[PDB]
Amino acid sequence: CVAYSNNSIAIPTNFTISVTTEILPVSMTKTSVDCTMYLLQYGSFCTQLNRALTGIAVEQDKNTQEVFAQVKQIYCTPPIKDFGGFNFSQILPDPSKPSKRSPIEDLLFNKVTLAGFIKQYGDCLGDIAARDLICAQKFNGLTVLPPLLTDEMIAQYTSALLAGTITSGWTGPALQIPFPMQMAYRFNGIGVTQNVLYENQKLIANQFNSAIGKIQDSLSSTPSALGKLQDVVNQNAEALNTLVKQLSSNFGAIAEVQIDRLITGRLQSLQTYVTQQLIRAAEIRASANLAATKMSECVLGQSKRVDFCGKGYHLMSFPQSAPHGVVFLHVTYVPAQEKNFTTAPAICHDGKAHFPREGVFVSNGTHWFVTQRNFYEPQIITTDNTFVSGNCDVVIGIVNNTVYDP
Amino acid sequence: CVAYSNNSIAIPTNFTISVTTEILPVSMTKTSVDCTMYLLQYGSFCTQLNRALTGIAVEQDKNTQEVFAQVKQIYCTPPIKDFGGFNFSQILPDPSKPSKRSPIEDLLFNKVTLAGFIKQYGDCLGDIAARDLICAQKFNGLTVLPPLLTDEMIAQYTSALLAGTITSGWTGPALQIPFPMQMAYRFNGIGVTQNVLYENQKLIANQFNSAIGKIQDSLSSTPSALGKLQDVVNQNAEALNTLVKQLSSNFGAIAEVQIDRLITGRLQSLQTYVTQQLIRAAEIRASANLAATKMSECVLGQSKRVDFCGKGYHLMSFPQSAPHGVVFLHVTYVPAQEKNFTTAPAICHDGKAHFPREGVFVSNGTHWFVTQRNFYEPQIITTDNTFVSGNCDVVIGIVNNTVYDP
Amino acid sequence: CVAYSNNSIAIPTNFTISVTTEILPVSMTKTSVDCTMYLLQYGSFCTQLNRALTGIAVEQDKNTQEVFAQVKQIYCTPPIKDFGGFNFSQILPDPSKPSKRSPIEDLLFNKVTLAGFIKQYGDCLGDIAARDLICAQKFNGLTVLPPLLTDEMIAQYTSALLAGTITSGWTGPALQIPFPMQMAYRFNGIGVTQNVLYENQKLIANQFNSAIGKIQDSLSSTPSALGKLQDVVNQNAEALNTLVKQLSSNFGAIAEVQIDRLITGRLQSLQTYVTQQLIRAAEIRASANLAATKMSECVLGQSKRVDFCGKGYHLMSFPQSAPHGVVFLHVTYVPAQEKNFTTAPAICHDGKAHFPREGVFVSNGTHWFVTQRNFYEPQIITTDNTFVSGNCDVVIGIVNNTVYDP
């Protein structure tokens, strides 16, 4: 417990900068059915379920656009990966490997990965020798469709977001600035004056480099973080396998009457598949909108609310791509070594009451100082860090101390 | 009407601090039915309505958590109830009465209170000698279930919120500070400099004490405010009585055919009850979310929007518990004695144009001053409350006045 | 592309003020049917569709209130239309024409205007000699009902909003101020110091007058902007004509059996009309809520988000009425002539590190200055625009330059 005090104030004298990951899926496997295998205005039965599959397939492109296609203007490649001591080598993409993903992005696409249909349709669809129709024939009607924005296009949106978050700050307003100077403005957004960063820059950079190194150390070796994306791929691949099991094994299970039971059994199996696809879309839409609002709040700016864009007070955020999802590298500030100091509302000198121009009056026991409330940086009391108004008699809790005029 | 002026500005020279109540219900009576009185995978008829009763019963715990369980960290008991002259004796709980509710909270639980089922099931459920099953037998199937968070647990959440709002300010950022100093920051959040509070502290405290006294004076003697909570308890107790009337009197009203009309009549009566319970939940969910967002906006911080967290410009807010609801004690600031003063954009001296470092230039008719725009606190024009830029010729509306250098 | 730099910062040295239009429909034609032509507790068939028509008719009054009836307090007529050089003659209403609409509002009601039922029912309803019932008889049952707030009442709400946005600023807080001084506060809200406006006031006013003149020049001559309101009137008038075509021509198309096909055909035609009226309400509700939130964000204040209240950084907004809609005259600021200057974190003098009290250190190549980051307004480095803390050794990127003490 931290209890009352009419005499004291708590101020932190240390801090630490932490980088933490948040994993959010935004997309889902776009499934479509060619009902001719199940001027063609409409079939009566298979069309009603396939129009819904088309509806959610368009929603996946809508979700991916709403999370990644939030900005377009190109900040050109950074590309040096040093930025005043902050090691961004884990985060910027390189042409040294022709995929041009970041080293962390490559790990996301390694751990989140695929006797199943998402495998079999791809093994069927050779970029040449195969087409949509020939494999809708070779495999009875079920298809997975191309994404509007592929992994590399999503990676280019991530690259532009990274360059725009490092070379400048997304709002305010917004114009290009050096990086440690930008984080000094992030400090001023927290409530800590800018000078606190420039004089701790190597320590802040070392804390950042340690946290960013342990992120990549954790992703592969401690896999318990990547589960949220393993689910969306595996459980939908399972959905396609469970459908095809009933559509392939139940050919020798379940004339006109026997046929009208078997085919309607296939339609009942399709209804079983479609209804849970439409239910999985309820999670994907919610998590995609969460990723979109955290893109606007954490990456495209600096958030006012706490524990939303990572734990602690928000500093900034960086995006990284993943199969059907995005990872937010939330950089946050948290104070440490809080300590109680005796405080006063005003300082009395020569019969006049002085108030801090910004900050608080605090004492080490023997002398009084003026200090910013959000970090212990004490200063002598002067005529240019205080302002005068009123009398030493009208104030409750006023205390006597000398005030200097340099 | 207040009309145009290119020459003048309106500034208030007085203010008053008001405390006002907002009453919001957040919970509803959790009803459940044991269908055996109406490996047991499912009954066909009574199960479908009882699963919905279970669904809204879980929603009541969800609503109560969303409004009260918004924070957990304990600020220990205050417990002195003086805080620089502001009398919080009406608001803090005491162990002098073993319920440990606040004196106002005890009045809320007095006026909002209960030949009816919410009474009869409780008179049936003795803490010993009775159980759930024996009274589901003694009274045909209808039950009201325990809340996840009882009145005392809700009171402990209120106690922690009060201690966290008095001992510190919930964001920014957030750390413990003396109370009148915290309200000085609330003044600076309004737009009035902090010194205006410390020199009016006894007057502000007296206004607060008068308003907080009239709140408790009003609740019991002028009951027209408590109606919003009387409704949610009485109209749901009426719903249970109206159900049981048809389930008990219509035993001698409405063989296999006569039975299949009577029992389905009981199910039709249950549908009548369940559908309006699910409609009452529409009000309870909306008001609980309103209480949750006003907990985050009014209690867990200071609101930027006006007339939301009480009438006038928002200062702070304090929670108090009530049967199935929460009361917000909105403390707000409103300016008074607005007055028009002649104003100028810049002051010309020695051929240079000076602008106020913050505030406006105003004149009493004979001399020019610099003043904060949000409260009339005039000051002499100096070189440290103005900044220089430009010429006396390029400015429209510029005026001549001396500027001093102390 | 704009690429990296650890050494430089981009600052704009020019700007331009633009006025742009956003058009939003908020209302829809309130249709009602007297089912006696198609103690009267209910008819079975026509009542179910007419209760829905009543439901959306009440929603149109709700939408119009939510967008226009957001404030009530009267700022009296301005009425001079000069406001420091900004020509508001296009925007304020005049009694020189007895409608008392603004010259732009009169153009909105000219271009958005009406062998059709919205015409025929009005030609039927003479203010005298006709009534609701006699024309529900002369034309079989279909009616369009009066709006709760007419065009002139909506115009009075617009007039009060204009007076409240010009004579004062709607929050903060809010009190009456001269107009160019208010826009100086709008500049400070953008991030540009107030003095930048007063010394460019004639240029800013000329840019405003040119944009506001081209708005009215565009509306009538280049009609491609007014289409969003042409649709909501014409396509609903078409809906009433398409209904009446089936209700009037199909009297000689489609005894008890032939009657029970014909009348149900009229009900099927009514279902065709009602379902698309309820679908058009989905657009009208969304656009009305967009107009309501942009009334609160753009007119009743100044928006923090970009490209929402017009393109560029938001300055202010003015409302104008239109048939079933509102037009927002978004005034926005956008910087121009961005230029790169060499920058430094701190300035070293006499062994002490100095930081800018607000702004950045920049150099013309030969000398160092301090400047606000959001507009190029350079200043000499002094002891009253910098503050001292730390040493010249602990800072990365520090540079040497003299600092003056006036």
Numbering used by the authors:
A (entry chain A), B (entry chain A), C (entry chain A): 704 to 741, 753 to 828, 831 to 887, 891 to 973, 989 to 1140
The authors write:
The S protein is composed of the S1 subunit, which mediates attachment, and the S2 subunit, which fuses the viral and host cell membranes. Similar to influenza hemagglutinin (HA), the fusogenic S2 subunit is metastable and will refold in the absence of the fusion-suppressive S1 domains as it transitions to an elongated, stable postfusion conformation. Here, we rationally engineer the sequence-conserved S2 subunit of the SARS-CoV-2 spike protein and characterize the resulting S2-only antigens. Structural studies demonstrate that the introduction of interprotomer disulfide bonds can lock S2 in prefusion trimers, although the apex samples a continuum of conformations between open and closed states.
